[PDB]
Every structure is written in C-alpha cells, then in structure tokens.
Amino acid sequence: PFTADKGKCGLPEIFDPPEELERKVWELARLVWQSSSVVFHTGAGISTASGIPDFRGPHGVWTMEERGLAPKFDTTFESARPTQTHMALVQLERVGLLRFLVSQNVDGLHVRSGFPRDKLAELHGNMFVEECAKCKTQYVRDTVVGTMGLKATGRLCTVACRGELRDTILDWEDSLPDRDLALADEASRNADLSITLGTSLQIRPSGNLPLATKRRGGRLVIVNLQPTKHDRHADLRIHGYVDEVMTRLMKHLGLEIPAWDGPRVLERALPPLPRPPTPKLE
C-alpha cells in the first residue's frame, strides 16, 4: 500500500504541432478504415476534461502526492459528464468500427456513457458497481459504492440469495477479474488495430495488452500527452488532448459524436448502425 510502486509520475508532456497532429490523425483515420477488428485501451487521461484528475500526469493523484500536494477534483464522480472521447467511443462501437473497449478507469463513465458492458472490460473495477459474493450478480448504482478493496458495502443481493454485496475496486494486492481480463486478452490478441487513449501503460498486465495486438502483425497507436512504457512498440504516437484527436478522427470517419442523455446502462450491444462508405486508401 504505502510501499506499492506507483511507477514514473510527473514526466513532461509532449505537444505535436498542429501540422504533425492533423497529419497523424489522418493516418489513424486510415488505420481504422484498414482494420477489420479495432480495440481501444483507455486510462484516466480520457476523463481529465470532465474534471477527474489522472494518476501520473502533471497534477496526477500520485504526482501531487510525491510533491506533498493534493489532487484537485473539479467534479464529483456522480456529477461527471463523459468526455467527447467517451461519446466518440460510443458511436465507434454503434457503427461497428470498435470490436472491444478495455479500461483501467474506475470512474464509471464508460458505463454511464451508454457503452455496451458486453464489449467492455473494466480491468480495475467500477466505483458504481457492487457485486454479489454468492452469485456474482453486479449492480450498476446511481451513486459511488462507498467502499474500496472488494469490501462489503452493507447491501445484500436481491435475485429471486441475500448474498453479501462488495465493491469491484481492486486493492494493490488484488488480482484482476478473470472474465474481464480474459475477454480483454482475446480481444487484444485477435485485434489488427489497438489504440491506447490517455493511459501511461505502466501497470501489468493492463498496460501490456496493446502489445498482444502487435504480435501477428497488428498495428499499435498510442494517444497520450506524456511518454508511456511501450512508446517503442507503437506504429504511431499522437501527443495531444484526446478530445481533439477523437473529434478530428470522427470528422474524418464521417461520424457525429452523439448527445449524452444523462447516466444510461446498456448491458448488451446492438447490431451495427449504418456507417459512411470507406475511402479508397492505396
């Protein structure tokens, strides 16, 4: 806990200049069109524009802690709106340009975004989701589950059970949930395109999954303001705000970023919605 390694925190940000940024997103555009199976890996950087601080960035939880300062939240978890990036990932799934989404975030926004849970691994859990110890039934709640570290919440299961309900937030010692990690690994290995959004890729095995894609000739794209463990293995690193990259990307793809109607829960994914026809690439 106190001892736990929080890896490299407070590294400098890189800012690709507009010309290099605009061009790198057109190449990302091309790789989404080329790819049969596109998987997105997300981390706390896709939630920073909502007012949720990240961990290892300039004003990250771990970064401000090293310098004896406090992270600053500009919102509560309950009153946080999903980002343009969160809503872009929703459209990309709906139009069939996103096979699987893998997140290290516990902020709960993916789910609150309306994103299909059966196409999502929440690898470090969800602040809003408690799980029945007895029958493994999950409850997506409307306020944050008040505990952390797979502890009893105080509520009991309501299946036609009275099983102990506990949080889904992994403690430093706790192993990842096998179902989520297994689907996340299959998705990552099977993928021909893995795009990482606002993660430093410093945690095992979360951070290593985008590298499973690169095996069998898959392409790896890293969108992050800072360096990242596996920058060396990327075919494309984009250094900029992900909201900018994903707003420009969606515009190249001919896609609108949909409205957020407030917190909604989508258990299962629907058949793909119509999407624009693919440009001639080669």
Ligand SMILES: Nc1ncnc2c1ncn2[C@@H]1O[C@H](COP(=O)(O)OP(=O)(O)OC[C@H]2O[C@H](O)[C@H](O)[C@@H]2O)[C@@H](O)[C@H]1O
């Ligand atoms: N607007 C932005 N656009 C793009 N990148 C951004 C933005 N804001 C921040 N970033 C980048 O976003 C990156 C986020 O890196 P880290 O803070 O390590 O997030 P993680 O999701 O990998 O944390 C992993 C786990 O570790 C914890 O213990 C928990 O268990 C976490 O689940 C940085 O490089 C920022 O520069």
Ligand SMILES: O=[N+]([O-])c1ccc(O)c(O)c1
């Ligand atoms: O307080 N928390 O639990 C936090 C702190 C920072 C985060 O980026 C986060 O997703 C949750």
Ligand SMILES: [Zn+2]
């Ligand atoms: Zn139960």
